């Protein structure tokens, strides 16, 4: 028998990359690549904002005079934010621009572990040189997709969490170019991140959870 | 005549799809939805994209 092993991980842009597993046998290619698309797409540890408190707005639906959107489009804008951390789970940032631009991820006061991979994400526009706009992002880990509904002060405003750092997974097994022995191919893997996690580390982990998983019947 | 004052609350609901819920198109075809599958289970092309 033959025992895969990765050889090659390129990343041709910074979102998406290609893991490549060489030496997989007949047969087994397929089999685990399924497995290994859905264990990635659907169980991996992510970042993403869960609360929001803006300086002085009292509920979602409520505009703001010196921003052009509404707080329910700010809010729709923080849902999608790529934020990477090192450390605890439930870490809050803080927001503070005044004068008229579009505010950025960069604008986020950035602590000594969190840092955020897309600085140009826009979150608002403030239309006013005597406008003012601070907020107070919570950021925790967490697994999977859950809603606001299921999870106290009336300042505070909740945001679905979106825990993915897998948006894109597709593979197709190519057959290898192992002379020695025949019907040998190789599993390559495409995944289109979100900027937080590493193929690497994703798909060992994904592999891991596979392991865990099977240690029932046997 | 007869009311000293009235006061007037405004609830404001943010509701969702749910397995139920009427869903048609522009042509004529209806329908409720049946179930909310899965991302990884629902049938992906050549290129990923379920």
Do not use: W
Request: hydrophobic content about 40%; charged content about 25%; overall charge negative.
């Amino acid at each position: 028998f033959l025992k895969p092993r990765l050889v090659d991980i390129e990343q041709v842009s910074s979102t998406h990359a290609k893991v490549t597993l060489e030496p997989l046998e007949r047969g087994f290619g397929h089999t685990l690549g399924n497995a290994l698309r859905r264990i990635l797409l659907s169980s991996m540890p992510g970042c993403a904002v869960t609360e929001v408190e803006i300086d002085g707005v009292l509920h979602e639906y409520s505009t703001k005079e010196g921003v052009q959107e509404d707080i329910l489009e700010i809010l729709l804008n923080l849902k999608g934010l790529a934020v990477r951390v090192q450390g605890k789970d439930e870490v809050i940032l803080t927001l503070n621009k005044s004068g008229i631009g579009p505010v950025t991820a960069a604008d986020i006061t950035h602590d000594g572990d969190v840092e955020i991979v897309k600085p140009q994400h826009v979150i608002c526009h403030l239309t006013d040189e005597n406008a003012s706009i601070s907020m107070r992002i919570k950021v925790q880990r967490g697994r999977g997709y859950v809603p606001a509904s299921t999870r106290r002060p009336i300042g505070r405003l909740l945001v679905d969490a979106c825990y993915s750092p897998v948006e894109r997974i597709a593979y197709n097994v190519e057959a290898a170019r192992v002379e020695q022995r025949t019907d040998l191919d190789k599993l390559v893997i495409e995944m289109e991140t979100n900027g937080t996690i590493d193929p690497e580390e994703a798909i060992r982990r994904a592999a891991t959870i596979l392991a865990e998983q099977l240690e029932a019947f046997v | 005549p007869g009311v000293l004052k009235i006061v007037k609350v405004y609830l404001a609901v943010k509701r969702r799809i749910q397995p139920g819920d009427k869903m048609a198109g522009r042509h004529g075809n209806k329908g409720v939805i049946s179930k909310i599958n899965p991302i990884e289970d629902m049938p992906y092309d050549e290129n990923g994209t379920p």
